[PDB]
């Protein structure tokens, strides 16, 4: 990877770029014919929001996603890994990939509400004051429909609406 | 009239009580009710629900054995399903034929 450093000395600023150590794909992918990193390692349909060892390899130090052209992911798996990282952040599973805070700002405290499988941004959802009849019931989404094709080891498929 | 029609409820509710008690008894050994009932039939054991509940209350060493047998047969099913028929049937999967 590549860094950028700005050092100001004697009213003079010097902006440079250094090349740091770079990781490399582990040798012998179980499926070298795979197109994207996922299919090359027989990982399609086999990861979830809690598999951070996988998800942490496709995000920036501050929790942002990395571009598809750089990672090489298929457009499809990019959307799965993108949703999975959104949910992993909201589950408190990426406690080091936190947003950069300018000028040492100390955020005001928030209520701790543990959560998992959170499809929507918490501040963006309204209360369900009128649940509606049983034949038109306003449901609560759980998980993501992007992961519907994940391998299900139970005879019942994932329920995405509670 | 309630007494006449209550004969249908009495039979229906006895079965739900037996099932409820068997579900309790199976869970103590880590089985679900259908895994126990389904696999006992596959072992050719035809003990019905009333007897099984009686065993769960009064003969728990026996009931645990019935649980182990059903659990064993269920594992033979998993092993069989994984195979393509080349492997022989499990020990407790073999059916006694009558003629």
């Amino acid at each position: 990877f590549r860094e950028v450093v700005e050092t100001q000395e004697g009213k003079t600023t010097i902006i440079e770029g250094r090349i740091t150590a770079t990781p490399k794909e582990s040798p012998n992918p179980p499926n070298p014919s795979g197109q994207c990193p996922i299919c090359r390692w027989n990982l399609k349909h086999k990861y979830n929001y809690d598999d951070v060892l996988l998800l942490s390899q496709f995000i920036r130090p501050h929790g942002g996603m990395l571009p598809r052209k750089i990672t090489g992911l298929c457009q499809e798996e990019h959307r799965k890994i993108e949703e999975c990282v959104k949910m992993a952040h909201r589950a408190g599973l990426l406690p080091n990939h936190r947003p950069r805070l300018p000028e040492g700002v100390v955020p005001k405290s928030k209520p701790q509400l543990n959560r998992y499988l959170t499809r929507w941004a918490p501040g963006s959802v309204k209360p369900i004051y009128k649940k509606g009849p049983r034949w038109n019931r306003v449901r609560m989404p759980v998980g993501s429909p992007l992961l519907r094709d994940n391998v299900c080891y139970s005879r019942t498929p994932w329920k995405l609406y509670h | 009239v309630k007494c006449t029609k209550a004969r249908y409820l009495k039979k229906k509710n006895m079965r739900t009580l037996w099932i409820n008690r068997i579900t309790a008894a199976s869970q103590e050994h880590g089985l679900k009710y259908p895994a126990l009932i389904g696999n006992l039939v596959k072992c050719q054991v035809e003990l019905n629900r009333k007897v099984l509940a009686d065993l769960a209350i009064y003969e728990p060493k026996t009931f645990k054995s019935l649980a182990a047998l059903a659990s064993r047969r269920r594992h033979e099913g998993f092993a069989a399903a994984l195979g393509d028929g080349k492997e022989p049937e499990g020990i407790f999967s073999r059916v006694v034929q009558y003629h």
């Binding site: 929507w120 941004a121 501040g123 963006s124 959802v125 309204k126 | -």
Partner: protein
């Protein structure tokens, strides 16, 4: 804002953003183009 079921950019500075769970049209050049998803 005007509430709209179909959001249409009216210019070339009119940009589409989703905030608060709904889509918006914000235009800094022509504020009369601002739309809200209904």
């Amino acid at each position: 804002f005007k509430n709209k079921t179909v959001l249409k950019k009216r210019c070339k500075d009119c940009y589409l953003v989703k905030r608060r769970g709904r889509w918006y049209v914000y235009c800094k050049t022509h504020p009369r183009h601002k739309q809200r998803q209904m």
